[PDB]
Design an enzyme around this catalytic site. Structure first.
Site, short mmCIF file in Angstrom:
data_model
loop_
_atom_site.label_atom_id
_atom_site.label_comp_id
_atom_site.label_asym_id
_atom_site.label_seq_id
_atom_site.Cartn_x
_atom_site.Cartn_y
_atom_site.Cartn_z
N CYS A 3 14.27 -13.00 23.98
CA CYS A 3 14.83 -13.26 25.31
C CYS A 3 16.32 -13.65 25.30
CB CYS A 3 14.00 -14.29 26.06
SG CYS A 3 14.44 -15.99 25.66
N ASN A 59 13.76 -11.68 34.86
CA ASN A 59 12.96 -11.96 33.69
C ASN A 59 12.71 -10.67 32.90
OD1 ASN A 59 11.65 -13.74 31.90
ND2 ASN A 59 10.11 -14.43 33.35
#
Lengths: 363, 325
Positions: free
Chosen positions: A134, A289
């Protein structure tokens, strides 16, 4: 979406039917008493939450049969707060050479609502998988954003090149976004995703996939524990930042502004693509996201803005962006460009002022 | 006891390095590294910044100052209560069979430590045995209340012998009391001492047992139902103790941010309300007396439906039938 009726919760038979229906709808090959028990646990908690007077709603998504400990350890394990402690400054900390300062520090005219998705500067929602990448995903949201803004061409960049090649970071075990942009400066650029596709596991640094690179001029950190400094940066380009996406409510977030509880130890990198305030008066951040379009609001989360000094879930703790020098800097109009205005306001680094005096006395 | 420093030490690398070495010398840390020094500055700056704020709580530079919160939590707060509850248990919000449902006259302030029903603060170590620790706080409490004798019980028996739970990998407090009922009782700590790692179930250490009549769960998402149970006996519950502020908690009422995945077990020994009007829970931790307020945390009470840090999510207690109801 997956729908259900309140009665399916009253009986084990009704709940088992609902489990298998959910399983069929999301193509889950698993069908175990343990997984059925987790489903019951999660569904009752979603049901209980949606019964409350909340600015946000939860949905029975594909992760419904995973415990939040299982969920977080598969999808939110980039250990940002951890790596920031080992090789980084505490949130809030000031620069080494206090000029270079923060490029957006002195902007005045900024929108009340920003959405980079509307200004063609945001790619489709991506998926990271089990990989704690991420930090690469977030860095790439920021990288795609500034390229789209400066060139007018929306191009998808490689998170995989960062995972494989950025040795300052820990690949699939996690890392930080600022060193990722430092990598992009020091190693001559980031290739498009078409050139270096995503695998979801660390592999060997293939320099033959690194072509049509985006080169950046610099990188900067947004001053920490300042949601206004963060608003000022987001108003110019998407910003990379960490967050704590732990907990049931974030695992099942579907719509609205998330105002719920969260810790302030970032574990997942995200890209802030905008901000605004809903009809009920709740200020928010539009966060992109990496959990696919199947999660949240088509892959997004409207997270509460202005809620804590560190921001809700530690959004305003460790935020940064890549710099692509403005070819046409603005433009306000007033005050006058002060000739006596120092290059260094602390008068430590330099005694030089921004201009020279024209009206001269003999002394 | 307490680690003191001055503001100006944070201004220079030389001053911070000095403070770090003084911190190692004071806490007997025999590992000096630029990485660990970096973690120390990270936590100290965050401690200093927090204490600068107008907070109902204070943080201190304890022995965990060199550990990242990820490192600390994974060493001291990994009993996976929320996890195990999802796999083999009911959702929180599981009021008619509850033994204290209909009590009317209850104190506004309770502190079992003052009614000689709370043992010394214990240390669990790297083991995720906090479910055994929470269960034992509740077990020691009811025994002290019913017998008038304060006796330390074995968390180690539960870790080794309770096969329904996962030893040092975690577990639930309710199955721990079920174990105490089904396996004829829990031995005192003197008989079955604590090691901090799972071992073989030694039945020769199991003697002078406390037998319990039953076990019950406090109705979930009800801090009043929890208050009613605590008023009668210390209660075992899971709580979320992740984050810097909980790693360094020292004093006051913790009102800070918290997740609601009650993965670490604790014993609620009391409740009350601060002179500033803040309602709280007095929670007994297993992180030694060196952490928090002599091993305790005054957690905020009445803050969320699930309770702050999910304190009112999964709470339970052992039953010793009242001889004089």
């Amino acid at each position: 979406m997956f729908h259900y009726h309140e009665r399916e919760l009253e009986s084990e038979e009704g709940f088992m039917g609902m489990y298998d229906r959910w399983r069929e709808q999301h193509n889950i090959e698993m069908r175990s008493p343990e997984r059925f028990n987790v489903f019951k646990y999660n569904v009752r908690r979603i049901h209980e939450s949606n019964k409350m007077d909340k600015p946000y709603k939860l949905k029975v998504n594909e992760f419904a049969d995973m415990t939040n400990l299982e969920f977080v350890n598969t999808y939110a394990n980039s250990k940002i707060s951890h790596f920031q402690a080992l090789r980084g400054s505490a949130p809030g900390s000031i620069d080494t050479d206090p000029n270079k300062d923060f490029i957006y520090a002195n902007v005045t005219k900024i929108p009340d609502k920003v959405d980079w998705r509307e200004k063609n500067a945001v790619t489709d929602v991506k998926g990271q998988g089990g990989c704690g990448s991420c930090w690469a995903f977030a860095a790439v949201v920021a990288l795609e954003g500034i390229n789209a803004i400066r060139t007018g061409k929306l191009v998808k960049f490689s998170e995989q090149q960062l995972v494989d090649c950025d040795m300052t970071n820990a690949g699939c075990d996690g890392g930080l976004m600022e060193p990722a942009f430092t990598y992009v400066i020091k190693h001559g650029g980031i290739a498009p995703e078409a050139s270096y596709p995503y695998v979801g596991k660390r592999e060997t640094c293939d320099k033959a996939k690194i072509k049509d690179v985006l080169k950046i001029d610099g990188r900067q950190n947004v001053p920490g524990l300042d949601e206004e400094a963060l608003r000022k940066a987001v108003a110019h380009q998407p910003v990379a930042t960490g967050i704590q996406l732990s907990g049931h409510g974030l695992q099942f977030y579907s719509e609205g502004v998330y105002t719920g509880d969260c810790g302030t130890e970032p574990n997942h990198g995200v890209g802030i693509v905008g901000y605004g305030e809903n009809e009920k008066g709740i200020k928010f951040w539009t966060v992109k996201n990496s959990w696919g379009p199947t999660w949240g609001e088509k892959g997004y989360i409207h997270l509460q803005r202005g809620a804590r000094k560190e921001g809700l879930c530690g959004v305003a703790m460790h935020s940064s962006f890549p710099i692509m020098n403005d070819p046409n800097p603005p433009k306000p109009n007033g005050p006058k460009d002060d000739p006596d205005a120092p290059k260094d306001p602390k008068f430590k680094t330099t005694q030089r002022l921004q201009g020279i005096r024209t009206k001269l006395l003999e002394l």
